[PDB]
Design a protein around this nucleic acid. Structure first.
Lengths: 191, 106, 171, 136, 197
RNA sequence: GCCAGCAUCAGUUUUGGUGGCAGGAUAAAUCCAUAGGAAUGUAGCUUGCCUCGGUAAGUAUUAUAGCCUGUG
RNA sequence: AGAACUGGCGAUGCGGGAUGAACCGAACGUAGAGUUAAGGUGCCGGAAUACACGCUCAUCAGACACCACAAAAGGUGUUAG
RNA sequence: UUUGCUCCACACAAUAUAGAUGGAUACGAAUAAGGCGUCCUUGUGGCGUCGCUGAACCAUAGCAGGCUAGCAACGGUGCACUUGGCGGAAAGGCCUUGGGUGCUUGCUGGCGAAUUGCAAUGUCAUUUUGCGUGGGGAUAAAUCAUUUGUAUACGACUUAGA
């Protein structure tokens, strides 16, 4: 119905300063810097009080205003990822074969090396994407932890590890072996 | 000076025509700087010359002229109709013609 | 075409048994004089036992509304034919005059429900004298206090076919 | 440091914005937006320049940076009083916008003779300018 | 009003540009189009890739050599659109196509000549904001064009030398602008301003 | 003799500028005067807490803006 | 395949429906000027990339009677009731 | 092969024109953003300004643009030389140093125009080729025929032969 004006509010915490280009967005924080291209949304930004930055669409339709909240949730996860950080925990599920996972190096490319999945002789190599650090957490049996600033890079690398261990030519309802995300929180949790 | 031009530039567009039939008795002319029938009304009745060269001298020159004049406007975009004493060849679609200022109403 | 509001008054032809007929009146939106008389006969035959031959038109008077400058908000009721059935409808048009509201309605129906002039009945056109008596959102939107908005991405129309600099859409 | 966001503010429409009529009977006169009808057309008034009150599409006008205070629904009498109070007429004239238009209308009115003074003066001014552009 | 018109094709719709240019040639105007690889076609890249593949399956069954030719260059894709808007089979139509040159990137001497645009074919003015568009360079590469990297390299070089030319130009036009300001408020300038100059 | 230019005309036609009238609710409007009303509530007042002054809500029907409707 | 009334083709060109005995317009000596019909006006192609309100994005869109096909049944696609 | 070929200058002819009749006048990028000016702590910076079309800018006066005189500045332009660079995407053009030369409408003077008769494109462009001069520059191959078989219906192919 071509809403005249709809807008959202992006809260800016004390420790970060949001520097927005024409539509290029850069967030700087204690944990680092993040950048994003937003030229495909056709929105406008404006700063109110150096702690709150508005984004608005004028004369927007159903899909145009739907993309408005998406932009707010993208920059918000950009600010959140550089203040608290994003940490994803995955467990290993297996019935008979212990899933052997290690961090290896191939010409300095930081591949994740997965062995013995359902007794397979195949080695599944998952590159570790830049900005995501991975450590095998102790005090928990068969857990892996992925963490970084950007949620999009962290979640994709977590999804890529889960995706590479899909079981084929079997009843996956019975054969449940694989690596699955059990938690999605923040590095600086309960600060 | 550098410029000695006393005529308005113009191009020979086509004959008067339907999509399958044309009338070679009427020619269509575009005048530079003319975009409306209101503006084109100033050049109605002006003398139009088509100047071309040839390898044969006839009466003391190698330049021949096909004289004409502007009769009326054509369309909404400043094109005008012209009729010449002899019909224009139609090899000259997109050739340039000279729209002189005489006869004058200024 | 561009519409005009006429009042049309007609009656059955007088006779010795019953002279002085009832002089029914009806408001018609039409482009010209002949259509206004026609639509009156069309609609009157739907209510009363009368037709053009068995009655007469006594008067026609074009109605042009009092305030061609004050902006109104009109509630409009219609009755239109779809490809499968006949349906009633109610909408608002916010504009400056009564006739321009109907001119908007006919285009609006033709654009959303493909309803042409023949298959539309305009039931009544009334002003919504009170704000907050508006029930549809697309006209309720413009009634806020200190309404203001930009017009981004302005496109200039060029006279010449060739431009010597890349156009800019600031506004 | 400080967070910076490019303002991106551009000629929003409201009651009081001054517009310039592009095409129609007026075609070049100033008018003020009085009421907002819909997103594509508004009611304007041009009483100082002779423009009457009428609804017009926003594609028939161009907004100007000039603006002033009108109450919503201002009739012809009060727009005239607020137009003189806000001094919109010479504020428009002082702008480079109206000067280029006045430049074009002056260049169109130049007779053949006074187009001969222009070339003579321009060659004189060219002599002084290019002389100055030989030592810097 | 111009011997040769050179068009910056970047940010143009291929069909509207083809129509505008096609009329220009039929009216006797010589046209050069450069930077064909940055031309746009309205519609998502997937849509335009399927259209070319549907075009790609049309060939003479018994001899593919005499069949329709599927030209893959961005300049050739624009040329095909323009050829359909012209009676290319007649002598006048062949004469029109001689008044046309389409280039990929900005080659020599056209690299030091003014480029114009056609606003009625420009993408930022024609298309509604948010609509998806295809770039001819990307589309050409997917169907067999080989020189995306060559052209990009030669435009990186060309734009560097072009920015060098402009930086000198801005310095000189500042120097001239300062002189005109000093030469202003002179009695000669006052009379010029009275006449609109 | 052949081909043209200009002027004054006649017939046919195409395109502009401009004058006087007649209608209509003897256009409706704008404008002027008067009465009443309301908020997308102007001034003023009060309350709340503020970078000493503007916010936020309550009152307030023209006041340091105005608007609507009727009648003439 | 077989009839009724009327109009046509046969026996008929011309403008239009790209194309077509039958549709639409209009029927014809040789020419000139003007104006139109039906159909059209991005380019081919003569004629507004006219003006105005809306709707539609289609990973087989749609695009003008005769006519050159598509149905039932479905869709928080989107719009108005 | 009876003086042939190529390049340079003008000398006259022939030839032809998809169509000069002042200038094709050079950032890139974005368009829900930019251009320019200025300042600093050189940035995704601050401040100011501009667009709303090239309807611009430049050029533009003189016998189709003549012949002379003076004044003011030391600039502007064309031309043949010359110094140094840059450009390979189809560069074949762009910038620059020095001197010479013509003009200069930056300003003020003197002489000439007529008769093409009341308009007649009223002829000023560039394409190619040829014949002449005078001034340099350099002195080959291919095919047929014979021959080979890595080839072959014939052509064609591949070899050899002072």
């Amino acid at each position: 119905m071509k809403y005249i004006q709809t807008e959202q509010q992006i809260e800016v915490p004390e420790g970060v300063t949001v520097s927005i280009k024409s539509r290029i967005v850069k967030v700087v924080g204690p944990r680092g810097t993040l950048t994003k291209n937003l030229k495909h949304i056709d929105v406008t930004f404006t700063k109110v009080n150096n702690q709150l930055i508005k984004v608005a669409v004028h004369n927007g339709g159903r899909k145009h205003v739907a993309a408005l909240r998406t932009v707010k949730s993208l920059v918000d996860n950009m600010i959140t990822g550089v203040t608290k950080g994003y940490k994803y925990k995955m467990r290993y599920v297996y019935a008979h074969f212990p899933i052997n996972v290690n961090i290896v190096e191939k010409d300095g490319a930081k591949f994740i090396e997965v062995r013995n999945f359902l007794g397979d002789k195949k080695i599944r190599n998952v590159p570790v994407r830049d900005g995501v650090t991975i450590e095998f957490s102790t005090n928990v049996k068969d857990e892996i932890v992925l963490s970084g600033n950007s949620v999009e890079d962290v979640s994709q690398n977590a999804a890529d590890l889960q995706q590479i261990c899909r079981v084929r030519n079997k009843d996956i309802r019975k054969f449940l072996d694989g690596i699955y995300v059990s938690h999605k929180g923040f590095i600086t949790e309960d600060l | 000076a550098e410029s000695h031009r006393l005529y308005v530039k113009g191009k020979h567009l086509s004959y008067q025509r339907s999509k399958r039939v044309n009338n070679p008795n009427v020619s269509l002319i575009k005048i530079e700087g003319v975009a409306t029938p209101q503006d084109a009304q100033f050049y109605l009745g002006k003398r139009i010359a088509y100047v071309y060269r040839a390898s044969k001298e006839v009466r003391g020159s190698k330049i021949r002229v096909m004289w004409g004049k502007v009769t009326r406007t054509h369309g909404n975009s400043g094109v005008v109709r012209a009729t010449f004493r002899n019909n224009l060849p139609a090899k000259t679609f997109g050739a340039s013609v000279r729209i002189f200022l005489y006869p004058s109403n200024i | 075409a561009h519409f005009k509001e006429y009042q049309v008054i007609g009656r059955r032809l007088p006779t010795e048994s019953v002279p002085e007929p009832k002089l029914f009146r009806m408001r018609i939106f039409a482009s010209n004089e002949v259509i206004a008389k026609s639509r009156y006969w069309y609609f009157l035959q739907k209510l009363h036992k009368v037709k053009k031959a068995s009655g007469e038109i006594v008067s026609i008077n074009q109605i042009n509304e009092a305030h061609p400058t004050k902006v109104k908000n009109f509630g409009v009721w219609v009755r239109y034919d779809s490809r499968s059935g006949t349906h009633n409808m109610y909408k608002e048009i916010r504009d400056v005059s009564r006739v321009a509201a109907v001119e908007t309605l006919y285009q609006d129906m033709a654009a959303r429900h493909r309803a042409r002039f023949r298959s539309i009945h305009i039931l009544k056109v009334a002003e919504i004298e009170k704000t907050a008596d508006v029930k549809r959102q697309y006209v309720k939107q413009f009634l806020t206090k200190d309404l203001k908005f930009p017009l981004p991405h302005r496109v200039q129309k060029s006279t010449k076919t060739f431009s010597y600099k890349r156009p800019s859409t600031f506004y | 440091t400080d967070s910076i966001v490019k303002a991106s503010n551009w000629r929003l429409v409201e009651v009081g914005r001054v517009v310039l009529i592009k095409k129609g009977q007026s075609a070049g006169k100033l008018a003020a937006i009085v009421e907002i009808i819909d997103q594509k057309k508004v009611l304007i008034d041009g009483p100082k320049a002779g423009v009457p009150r009428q609804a017009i599409n926003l594609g028939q006008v161009v907004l100007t940076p000039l603006t002033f205070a009108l109450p919503r629904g201002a009739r012809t009498a009060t727009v005239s009083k607020k137009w003189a109070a806000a001094a919109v007429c010479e504020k428009w004239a002082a702008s480079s916008w109206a000067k280029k238009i006045a430049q074009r209308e002056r260049r169109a009115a130049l007779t053949d003779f006074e187009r001969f003074q222009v070339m003579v003066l321009r060659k004189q001014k060219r002599y002084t300018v290019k002389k100055a552009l030989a030592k810097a | 009003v111009e011997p040769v018109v050179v068009i910056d094709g970047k940010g143009h719709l291929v069909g509207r540009l083809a129509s505008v240019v096609a009329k220009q040639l039929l009216n006797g105007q010589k046209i050069v189009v450069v930077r064909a690889e940055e031309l746009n076609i309205s519609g998502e890249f997937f849509r335009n890739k399927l259209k070319y593949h549907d075009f790609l399956r049309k060939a003479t069954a018994f001899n593919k050599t005499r069949g329709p030719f599927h030209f893959r260059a961005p300049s050739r894709i624009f040329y095909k659109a323009l050829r359909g808007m012209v009676s290319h089979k007649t002598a006048r139509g062949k004469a029109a196509l001689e008044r046309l040159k389409v280039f990929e990137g900005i080659p020599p001497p056209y690299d030091k000549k003014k480029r114009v645009v056609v606003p009625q074919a420009l993408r930022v003015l024609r298309l509604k904001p948010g609509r998806k568009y295809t770039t001819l360079g990307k589309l050409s590469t997917s169907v067999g064009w080989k020189y995306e990297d060559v052209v990009a390299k030669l435009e990186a070089k060309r734009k560097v030398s072009s920015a060098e030319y402009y930086a000198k130009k801005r310095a000189f036009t500042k120097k001239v602008a300062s002189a005109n300001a000093t030469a202003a408020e002179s009695d000669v300038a006052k009379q010029l301003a009275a006449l609109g100059y």
